[PDB]
Amino acid sequence: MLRWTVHLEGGPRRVNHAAVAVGHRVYSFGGYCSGEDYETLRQIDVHIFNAVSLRWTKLPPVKSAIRGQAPVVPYMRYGHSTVLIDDTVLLWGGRNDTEGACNVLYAFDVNTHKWFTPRVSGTVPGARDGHSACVLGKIMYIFGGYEQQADCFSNDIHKLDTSTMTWTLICTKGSPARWRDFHSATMLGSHMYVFGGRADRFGPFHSNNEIYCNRIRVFDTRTEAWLDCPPTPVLPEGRRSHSAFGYNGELYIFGGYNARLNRHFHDLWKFNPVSFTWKKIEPKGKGPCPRRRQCCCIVGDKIVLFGGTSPSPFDLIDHSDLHILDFSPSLKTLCKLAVIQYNLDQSCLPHDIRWELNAMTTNSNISRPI
Amino acid sequence: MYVKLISSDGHEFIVKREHALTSGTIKAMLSGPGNEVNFREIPSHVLSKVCMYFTYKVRYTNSSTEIPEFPIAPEIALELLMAANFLDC
Amino acid sequence: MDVFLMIRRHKTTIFTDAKESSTVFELKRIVEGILKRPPDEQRLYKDDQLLDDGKTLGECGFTSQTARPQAPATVGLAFRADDTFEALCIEPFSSPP
Amino acid sequence: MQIFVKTLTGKTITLEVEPSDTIENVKAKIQDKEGIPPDQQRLIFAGKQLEDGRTLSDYNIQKESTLHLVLRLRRG
């Protein structure tokens, strides 16, 4: 049973970034960090965490393809979304402080690392931050977020059909989920599960009536309808900037922040769509400290969790650490953890084991402590 | 249905074949060309613990109810780690 | 519900599970299919207490809380020798340094 | 006269102002007293978003009243 097995430092110090897993490597894009520059013209960022060697690397700046043309790469931003379809990360949305939000679709090839901006057609969603993105087949689904031009929360679903690069504003049936940002949306089968996020209890505008959603909402992509679903007797506290992932057919949500309670979270909740029920999960080991707007990616039976913001022991810090939650720890993993914990001499061990012990106990050098 | 795992000091451990398959190494050995396995290098106090891990793993896979941890005494951790690495489990 | 067991005789150790409600005799028939000796040629013990064929494991004291998969409860086994039974004898596992 | 600005988490910021001052003025004084650029600021009174052009007396903000400060969620 599931356990926090790795805690590593020296990664990118980022919150409000976006990341996808490609094989056993996690690609992290952009994000915010206090004290660093989010006004001037900077290229967006790509750091890669290797989940076998447990090393962070960073990709070098994008160069101009032809003299006189600018490099093709999104500007440094936060609150954007990234999804993976085949060999392509689709990056959309977000903002920086200067240029605000842009709604240009960006594509990133995970093998060649070239960026491009495929020509799209249809009703392009307005620029926004804090939306959710998820995919089913060749279709990307964008929901929610805070629209920069309309200046409002969104409860639209825009789908991008990457086969033709065509945006559709979906005319949904049923009661749409409440306008909101910094929610999550997770695909389980053909159904999109929307949880949490910041919202207004009366409408799509800020009005000093901010609320933290916890009535999960379900969107069927086959019939493009919001479903009416049974009550959940037990449910997690409302929150924003949690992480959501689907593993073995079930939804998991980690962490987040509730402003009404002024509380950061490091809990773990499982939702089973079939029983339609929630359950708080207690992993073994010391997890990450309560935090919000970290990123979570799935690598086999493990979740790579890294980044985010939390209060500083009003006085927030950004995280360069990284955690691994292992849903099914091998005996070898439990024994390395014991050898580390009891601080036993490792020089008897064969070099393959020692390489592993070293990997899980050595910081990367993207960042230094503040 | 059951298989026999013999330790270096000659203890015999009879475990469900499905449990022993938790070890990739044993999985390979039971499917060799042309049932029991002799481990000339793993003593009984280590191999008994490995079998308990088999039982624990199969029983608690895809389980979310809270359960005890798999206890690993310091005096056994280095040998157990070397065994788990050799057994790919 | 489930009790996780080690049935031990000399240098033999069987790992198996059973229900709290299953009987000592059912336990003997698992041994029979492994070690090819019938129940009437077996004695099963909880520590030093001989176990009756018709008691359930729970009635003998085996509880799921104390027979967990990572900490199986031990059941001693003795075979009939000729007209009499061998003494219950369990060889200890080796010891760490 | 004086007014207060409070975010959802807390941290009152009492500001010295007069009714003629615009909402842009109050965002300016807030930046002086907390180091928050006005573009990341959203002031709300009586559940209405305050326009940068209208002044304080245009929204009926008398002495001792509190405005609500909403910020860009740069850190989520």
Numbering used by the authors:
A (entry chain A): 1 to 313, 321 to 377
B (entry chain C): 17 to 50, 58 to 112
C (entry chain B): 1 to 97
D (entry chain D): 1 to 76
Question: What's written in the study?
Answer:
The largest cohort of CRL SRs recognizing terminal degrons are the four BC-box proteins in the KLHDC-family (hereafter collectively referred to as KLHDCX), KLHDC1, KLHDC2, KLHDC3, and KLHDC1031,32. These SRs all feature Kelch-type 6-bladed β-propellers that recognize C-degrons bearing terminal Gly residues. Members of the KLHDCX family employ Kelch-type 6-bladed β-propellers to bind substrates, and a BC-box binding EloB/C that serve as bridges to a cullin (CUL2 or CUL5). Importantly, we discovered that these E3s share a defining C-terminal carboxylate-anchoring element (R/F-S-R) establishing them as C-degron E3s.
To gain insights into the structural roles of penultimate residues within the degron sequences recognized by KLHDC3, the crystal structures of KLHDC3 bound to ubiquitin harboring Gly75Arg or Gly75Gln mutations were resolved to 2.6 and 1.9 Å resolution, respectively. The structures superimposed with the wild-type ubiquitin-KLHDC3 complex with 0.23 and 0.09 RMSD over main chain atoms, respectively. Both mutant degrons engage the KLHDC3 binding pocket in a similar manner as for wild-type ubiquitin. In particular, Asp325 forms extensive interactions with side-chain atoms from the substrate ubiquitin’s Arg or Gln. Mutation of ubiquitin’s Gly75 to the consensus degron residues Arg or Gln resulted in ~3- and ~2-fold tighter binding, respectively. As expected, the Asp325Ala mutant KLHDC3 was relatively defective in comparison with the wild-type E3, but only towards substrates that contained an Arg residue in the penultimate position of the degron sequence. For example, adjacent to the C-terminal Gly-binding site in KLHDC3, an aliphatic/acidic pocket determines preference for a Gly/C-degron’s penultimate Gln or Arg. The shape of the KLHDC3 pocket and acidic nature of adjacent surfaces explains this E3’s general preference for Arg residues in substrate C-terminal regions.
